[PDB]
């Protein structure tokens, strides 16, 4: 029931695939402040992700801030992984 606080979120349950660069960011998807899932993604990059009812084009900046057209109730938030 807390407001979204990435400092208190457990890390994503991720796998760094060995043949590609390690992605710099963790992402966390919430619906009305409840964590739905989490993963890894590249910084200074782009992806298409299913966020609730809609496909969303999400851009990441160099500090893992995520932007896109999130539908009502939903958000995807980023943060840099340790050491990046």
């Amino acid at each position: 029931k807390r407001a979204i606080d990435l400092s208190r979120e457990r890390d994503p349950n991720f796998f760094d695939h060995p043949g590609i660069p390690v992605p710099e960011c963790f992402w966390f998807m919430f619906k009305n402040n409840v964590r739905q899932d989490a993963g890894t993604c590249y910084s200074s990059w782009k992806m298409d992700m299913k966020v609730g009812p809609n496909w969303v084009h999400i851009k990441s900046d160099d500090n893992c801030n995520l932007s896109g057209d999130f539908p009502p109730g939903w958000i995807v938030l980023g943060k840099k992984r340790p050491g990046f």
Partner: protein, 79 residues
């Protein structure tokens, strides 16, 4: 070859048998370099490769593993 693809599926998976079948099916698909099960619920199937027919792959997952949905389609940042 080309810049690699990253495709993530969400597949409700009852247990580790289902997971094993999904990983085997994906690994046997043309173009796949690696596959892992990830996510908070252990139901994200993360696929990396080059020239994957994701159309056919989702169909095969739906027939053999469970009700697969796309979560993400992206390219790998290689530079």
């Amino acid at each position: 070859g080309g810049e690699m693809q990253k495709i993530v599926f969400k597949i409700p998976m009852v247990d580790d048998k289902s997971r094993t079948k999904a990983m085997s099916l994906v690994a046997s698909t043309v173009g796949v370099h690696s596959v892992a099960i990830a996510g908070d619920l252990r139901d994200q199937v993360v696929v990396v490769g080059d020239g994957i027919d994701s159309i056919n792959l989702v169909s095969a997952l739906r027939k053999k593993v469970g009700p697969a949905m796309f979560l993400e389609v992206s390219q790998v940042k290689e530079d």
